[PDB]
Design a binder for these strands. Structure first.
Lengths: 113, 189, 212, 80, 130, 141, 65
RNA sequence: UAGAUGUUUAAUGUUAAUUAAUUUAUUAUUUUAAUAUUUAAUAUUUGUUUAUACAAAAGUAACUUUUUUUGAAUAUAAAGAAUUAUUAUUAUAAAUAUUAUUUUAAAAAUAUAAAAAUAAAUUAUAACAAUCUAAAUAAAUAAUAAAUUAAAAUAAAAAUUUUAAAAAAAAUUAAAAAAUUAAAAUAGGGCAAGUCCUACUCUCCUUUACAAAGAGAACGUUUAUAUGUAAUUGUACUAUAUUUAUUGAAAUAAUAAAAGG
RNA sequence: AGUUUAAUGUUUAUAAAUUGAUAAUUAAUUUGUUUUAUUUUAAAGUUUUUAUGAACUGUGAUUUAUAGUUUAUUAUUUUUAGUUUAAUGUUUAAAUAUUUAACUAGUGAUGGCACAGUUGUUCUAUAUGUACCUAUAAAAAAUAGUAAAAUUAUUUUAAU
RNA sequence: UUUAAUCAAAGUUAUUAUUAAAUAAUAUUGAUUUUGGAUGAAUUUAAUUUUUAAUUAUAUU
């Protein structure tokens, strides 16, 4: 039901294949779900990976199992032109907080007499 | 009353006729109705393993939400936030994220000691992507000479305490940020 | 993760018993400076004033009572050093030296006013003589603080919270979102229902025609 | 989950509880009727909204028969 | 594999997804039996309509009012809404013991009946001076 | 079970009181039609009908010296064999006697006359032996 | 099969069908850790079977505390 | 000495009404699960030298800080026969790396392996040579009622003989042989019944059925009916009869259980 | 650690039988505040109800020619490192290993998918279905009613 | 230095604990962390049968 490039190849050698988590606010459709119907598939990407017919395992080559939870949220779909066509900067938590130091600063700690 | 089944064949002793088989398991005797336990004993659903192959359980729990209910809005007492606000960037748990970020970018002091390195290394949390880190150096530390950020998602380090109880340090990520200028640390010497 | 041997816990439960829930003594009546005498065990009957209390352990450090030699192993700098020092003794085996009767006397936090009590309450009542006692405060650190990193008490006292130009602004950031999804919840209320009422408004038309 | 648990079938009376289901169209399986609105309504209220002439008109008995299913025995008073 | 034995046992989140109704969409019956005014070509307001309405329950919508005459296609989603959303075998404990008498059970709705407090039963039996 | 082990850690089935037997099992229907025990106590003899049983062809020309219909007591061994099934109601008690073959009115009385039955108005005083109550005439099912 | 006892530190022969063992290289006998399973306890850290757990406490109350 | 004519335990025992000498009558030969022997001075271990290709699944006893890409996210070593064991786990790619584990100073049997004779590669060969100590270290296995023996002769019991009896005079130790001791009332013929087997004419409970009735029989179902062995079963006037007709057969060549020689 | 037939009958207080039946009565004459629950231990073939199993060994269906050779022959006769057998091994390097022994020449096949126990595959061996085909897993009782084997306490007092 | 060779094992050990089992009539949407994630059908277990519902006698048939 999700963007099929997450399932099969968007290219020759399977660039998009993997599990993807999306911030609950953006309209970018992800593939990670914890429904029981979807777990025998989600677990294989953790414990086995994917064997693209091109002869290169994509989502999981070596030993440590990827953690589908802490994957940073989805931000685009891969075009054959760039690595990614970034589709929603609304996920990127660009830290837009400024700080002054001029007047009545607030040290990280506070003092008692 | 129930009247027990009877097993003393003798003068009558003709179970071959009306006698229906009462060898059928004796439900009446075990009548204590509390379920036995399954002979292949299902282990506790807690994950015991702690080594480097600690996988993440996909199965979505029940009490998990019922605690994230009461931690975004008092669940049994206060009423649910309207969904227009609940699914909005103004929903407090999401509100406290666009104006009050909470990350931990711990640079390894071991990396840039007396030596001079143009590639510092950071123990960033696992949620933070490559871009999300650059926008974190340029806005909070005003470090704006990044070239390329690599990613080595490393599992946190285990250890056993003095008793010998398995413990672990929260997972992190190693991001080899390619700087433009050789940076060091002038250790007072 | 694995458990310990049976005999292993048995040794580790007796060492650290306070790990139980609420190991402390339900009212805490032993304080530094109290006048207390031991009762039973080693040296039954000596009198000495408390100097420190280990609350979570139900024990007491008392002057000259149960004194032992705290050996101090040291590295190549200092030699093996020995130091005498009285030891934590359990409060279960000591009782108070009543400042008048100098006998056994239990001591309960008490409430209710007798003779112009400041909070209209006594703070530690002796049963035999009746002269109460106070319950002091444990000391906070006086010489703590980093002047290069500690905001002075005044920059923590500059009230900048004018709730009449931010809270009226918050309620806009919230109400915009509510007014959005609600009218956005009128898509299926319109993009689905409008089609049905057409098969009605297209029926009156084809009903008006037929009669004619 | 169920937003808005539906109300009972025939709680038209003000004092006596509604009849069991099936009788009024539902699922057979209980010989009682329980209107939570009727119980939570206190006594001084339940007697307020009625008069003696009316109380003797919903305590009304049809014991050998059903007041809702014509020709049918009172399935409040049957074996099952 | 060692982990998969003692993590696949965790009870996944359950709820009572009750039967969807494709063939009988009950939402498009607020436009049934609606008089249409001639000049305007729209459903003039029928104040009598909302009282021949059998409010059908629903999981995404509170209750959908349907004209009585088409109510019988939705007799299941009625009996599925009364039913306690749990399986019975988890709330069985309210059915076998002597709390059988203190619990509603119409349509397997394992919900509690009204119970007097312990302080009320005191006063409600002293005011009878018994 | 030692103190605590996987055989006691877990929880197999559990066992409750065993239901009893019919109180008068050992007066088996097959004897209550063959014999009748007669005589005073300490002289209980079990007489059974005497004489041959064969059903010949149409012969049997004498019906008068046919079976004399006499009760003659069974062999002394077998009386002890059956009666042995009767004593085991309360073994180890020299006090009690053998439970009789056919019921007696004190047995039919004492059975439902205990304290525990004192309020069981119906079935008291042998209601199950009397002819039934004349049922109602407006009775129906 | 199964000539001795059923414990892993038993004395006579056994079989892997009746009494299937986990392959434990060297564990402690019934009379305590001899000087062979302690060559690990001071180098490997824990007994070499991996199943036993390294209660290194009373040494910590010997040196550090 | 001691009640008696011999098989249903003795108890205020630190009064489960006590508080400093209770010195507590208490133990099941074997089926239990723990330890300890004996086999055991042992069997097996023993590390000084060979010729290098790539995947995946496979593990994760596991660490990492150090350059994955210019793709964002993700992940980069480790097995399986229980093992660090008889082993190139080879789908693919390959061709001049000395690319890094094998004790011992004796002798036999055996085990591998080896010049000469009654045109070929063979023989058999249970023939030289060659390899396999000991001690040192490490240590298992099945087995175990114990002996006071055990050399050697020699008779005695439904008996088969473990013993006992007379008569002898039989010493330690290591090594090597297996003569004796520690592993079934059996093998072969000759007969007769039985199970197995085939075969139906007559036997029993088959169900799956088919037709019949019933509905103006587009079909769905419920009763009444004898078919196949479908297929399982089993079948040696006081007298003087009766309790058995009720499936029938085949060297059914092999099995079984008996007798007989 | 280890095996279960109540060695006792004190005041309220009263317990008989008999016909095949109706019934009949010198039914002679007891006992009892009503006494009830117990019946070894271990232990075979088996049954039964649900379940699981093709990573093993069984038979499909997708591989359409990384090797040397005899005969003109594209068949071939072959090659044969793939094919029904004999010794050693004897808790053995292996809970079937190394050598010995009996024929077929991949344009039709290494698993795709599929089958499962009162029954699969079946090239029809009552062979094989994960190191004992009594398949495995779970729960249970009729299962030594069977030369079965065990059954805890000396000093005694009646016999065959 | 000589031992001719042999012959014996009897009767006590530290420093830390409060767990099991039965009993009790007053809880209860599944024990082991944050669903779906498209805004939808994943998270459905219902049907008149000794059932987690468990029965004060010895007669008659």
């Amino acid at each position: 039901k999700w963007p099929a490039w997450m399932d099969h190849g968007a290219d020759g050698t399977g660039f998009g294949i993997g599990l993807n988590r999306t911030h609950p606010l953006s309209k970018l459709r992800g593939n990670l779900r914890r429904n029981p119907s979807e777990i025998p598939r989600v677990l294989n990407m953790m414990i086995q990976g994917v064997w693209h017919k091109s002869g290169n395992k994509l989502y999981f080559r070596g030993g440590k199992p990827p953690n589908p939870s802490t994957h940073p949220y989805l931000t685009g779909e891969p075009c054959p032109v760039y690595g990614w066509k970034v589709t929603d900067p609304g996920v990127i938590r660009e830290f837009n907080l400024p700080q002054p130091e001029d007047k009545t600063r607030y040290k990280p700690y506070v003092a008692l007499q | 009353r129930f009247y027990r089944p009877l097993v003393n064949q003798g003068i009558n002793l003709w179970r071959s006729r009306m006698g229906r088989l009462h060898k059928g398991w004796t439900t009446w005797e075990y009548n204590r109705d509390v379920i036995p336990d399954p002979r292949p004993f299902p282990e506790p659903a807690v994950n015991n393993y702690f080594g480097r192959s600690r996988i993440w359980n996909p199965i979505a729990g029940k009490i998990g939400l019922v605690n994230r209910k009461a931690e975004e809005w008092g669940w049994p007492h206060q009423r649910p936030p309207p969904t227009g606000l609940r699914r909005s960037p103004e929903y407090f748990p999401f509100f406290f994220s666009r104006y009050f970020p909470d990350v931990e970018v711990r640079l390894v002091l071991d990396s840039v000691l007396n030596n001079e390195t143009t590639r510092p290394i950071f123990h960033i949390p696992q949620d933070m992507s490559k871009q999300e880190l650059v926008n974190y150096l340029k806005n909070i530390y005003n470090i704006d000479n990044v070239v390329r950020i690599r990613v080595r998602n490393m599992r946190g380090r285990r250890f056993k305490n003095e008793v010998g109880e398995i413990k672990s340090l929260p997972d992190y990520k190693v991001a080899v940020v390619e700087l433009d200028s050789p940076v060091s640390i002038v250790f007072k010497q | 993760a694995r458990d310990l041997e049976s005999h292993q816990k048995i040794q580790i439960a007796g060492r650290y018993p306070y790990f139980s829930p609420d190991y402390e003594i339900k009212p805490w009546i032993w304080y530094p400076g109290d006048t207390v005498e031991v009762v039973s065990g080693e040296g039954a009957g000596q009198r000495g004033a408390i100097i420190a209390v280990v609350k979570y352990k139900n024990e007491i450090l008392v002057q000259n009572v149960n004194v032992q030699d705290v050996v101090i192993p040291a590295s190549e700098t200092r030699p093996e050093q020995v130091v005498q020092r009285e030891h934590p003794i359990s409060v279960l085996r000591v009782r108070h030296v009543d400042p008048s009767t100098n006998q056994l006397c239990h001591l309960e936090i008490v409430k209710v006013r007798n003779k112009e009590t400041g909070e209209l309450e006594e703070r530690r009542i002796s049963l035999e003589s009746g002269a109460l006692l106070p319950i002091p405060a444990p000391e906070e650190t006086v010489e703590a603080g980093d002047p290069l990193k500690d905001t002075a008490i005044q920059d923590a006292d500059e009230e900048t919270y004018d709730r009449e130009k931010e809270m009226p602004l918050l309620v806009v950031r919230r109400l915009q979102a509510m007014e959005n999804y609600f009218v956005d919840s009128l898509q299926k209320s319109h993009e689905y229902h409008k089609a049905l009422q057409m098969r009605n408004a297209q029926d009156m038309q084809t009903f008006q025609k037929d009669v004619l | 989950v169920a937003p808005w648990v539906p109300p009972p079938r025939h709680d038209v009376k003000v004092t006596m509880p509604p009849p069991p289901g099936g009788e009024v169209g539902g699922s057979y399986g209980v010989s009682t009727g329980y209107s939570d609105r009727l119980a939570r309504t206190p006594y001084w209220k339940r007697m307020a909204l009625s008069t003696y002439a009316l109380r003797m008109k919903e305590n009304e008995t049809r014991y050998p028969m059903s007041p809702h299913r014509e020709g049918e025995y009172d399935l409040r008073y049957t074996v099952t | 594999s060692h982990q998969l034995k003692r993590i696949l046992n965790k009870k996944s989140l359950h709820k009572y997804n009750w039967d969807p109704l494709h063939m009988y969409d009950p939402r498009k019956l607020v436009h049934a039996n609606r008089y249409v005014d001639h000049d305007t070509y729209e459903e003039k307001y029928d104040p009598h309509w909302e009282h021949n309405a059998h409010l059908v329950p629903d999981q995404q919508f509170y209750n959908i009012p349907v004209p009585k005459e088409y109510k019988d296609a939705y007799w299941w989603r009625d009996l599925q809404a009364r039913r306690v959303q749990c399986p019975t075998e988890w709330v069985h404990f309210r059915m076998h013991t002597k709390d059988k008498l203190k619990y509603d059970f119409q349509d397997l709705a394992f919900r509690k009946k009204f119970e007097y407090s312990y302080e009320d039963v005191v006063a409600n039996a002293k005011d009878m001076c018994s | 079970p030692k103190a605590g082990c996987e055989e006691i850690t877990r929880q197999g089935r559990r066992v409750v009181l065993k239901p009893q037997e019919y109180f008068a099992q050992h007066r088996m229907q097959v004897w209550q039609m063959r014999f009748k025990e007669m005589g005073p106590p300490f002289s209980r003899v079990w007489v059974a009908l005497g004489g041959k049983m064969r059903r010949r062809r149409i012969g049997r020309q004498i019906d008068v010296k046919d079976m004399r219909y006499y009760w003659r007591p069974i062999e002394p061994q077998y009386q002890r064999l059956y009666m042995s099934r009767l004593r085991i109601k309360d073994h180890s008690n020299k006090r009690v006697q053998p439970m009789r073959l056919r019921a007696t009115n004190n047995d039919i009385g004492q059975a439902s006359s205990l304290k525990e039955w004192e309020r069981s108005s119906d079935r008291k005083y042998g209601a199950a032996l009397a002819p039934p109550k004349k049922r109602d005439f407006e009775f129906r099912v | 099969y199964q000539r001795g006892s059923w414990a892993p530190g038993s004395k006579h022969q056994k079989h892997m069908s009746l009494n299937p063992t986990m392959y434990l290289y060297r564990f402690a006998g019934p009379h305590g850790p001899g000087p062979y399973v302690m060559k690990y306890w001071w180098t490997l850290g824990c007994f070499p079977t991996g199943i036993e757990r390294p209660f290194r406490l009373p040494e910590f109350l010997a040196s550090y505390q």
